[PDB]
């Protein structure tokens with residue numbers, strides 16, 4: 577009912593030793609070589625602390641998972657070990673757990689982050705092209721290794737603006753992509769969910785991450801956080817419909833034999849396509865160019881087979897300032 581455009585082969589061509597995370601045996605580190613300092617974050621199934629690896633006296637992150645669904649835990653570890661050394665992927669330092677409760681933690685590199693609603697308004701046009709390009713690098717890498725993040729959003733993009741470095745964190749929803757598999761649609765955060773998630777289409781792929789990338793980018797360049805502000809998961813589809821249009825939605829559902837749910841009959845009207853240019857303001861004009869709008873317009877498409885691949889998106893003209901800049905550094 578849908579295969580991915582790119583990289584569909586990958587997990588088949590790497591081994592079952594690459595994707596079969598149920599049978600991974602975890603060689604736990606020593607829980608007591610870490611000391612938790614201060615709370616830096618929270619989560620649905622987690623808590624995150626700044627911490628010290630005692631034997632080296634060094635800063636790191638300790639993220640304490642919820643111990644149940646044991647294989648959901650091995651999934652995140654198998655993905656982190658697989659993506660070892662990948663450009664702009666958060667580095668895995670250790671996996672430890674408590675001797676008595678068997679509650680596990682993942683230990684990752686620390687990144688001196690600025691929270692995005694503070695940091696994003698401080699970006700220049702170049703910053704945006706540059707940090708999106710760096711993030712495209714992580715997305716392309718893990719996609720080319722047969723993995724979907726499925727929770728791309730600002731909150732999982734650590735930026736050390738002083739170091740001009742980027743890390744994609746939180747692979748607790750990352751699943752391996754197997755052609756034709758029916759994945760769970762209850763993934764990603766509301767404001768970054770794809771239309772395929774919102775209409776219960778289960779045979780999605782690496783293109784889901786591109787719709788989310790486009791939701792980030794849209795809010796960066798139009799200065800509208802979040803860009804699609806649905807009150808529930810049904811309102812999410814209507815808020816997207818008010819921009820992309822109800823015509824192109826109906827052609828896409830037909831293209832995929834998706835039958836919309838009956839709740840939508842009363843809430844989903846006929847909406848015309850609002851051009852991207854109506855989101856241009858004076859406060860957000862610094863980020864606007866035709867390169868940018870064109871690029872956003874090829875991320876944010878109902879049909880996931882119409883979205884750019886992360887590889888394709890790096891080729892985009894928008895990023896040419898970044899390409900040539902890094903080349904002249906060379």
Ligand SMILES: Nc1ncnc2c1ncn2[C@@H]1O[C@H](COP(=O)(O)OP(=O)(O)NP(=O)(O)O)[C@@H](O)[C@H]1O
Nearest residue numbers: 617618619620621622624637685686687731745746
């Ligand atoms: N390497 C890191 N460096 C700095 N801060 C980090 C790092 N990893 C995580 N954090 C912080 O911890 C928060 C939560 O981390 P995360 O790994 O997304 O846990 P989570 O339980 O999966 N949260 P959620 O996004 O709701 O699923 C982030 O939003 C960051 O502020």
Ligand SMILES: [Mg+2]
Nearest residue numbers: 746747748749
């Ligand atoms: Mg998570």
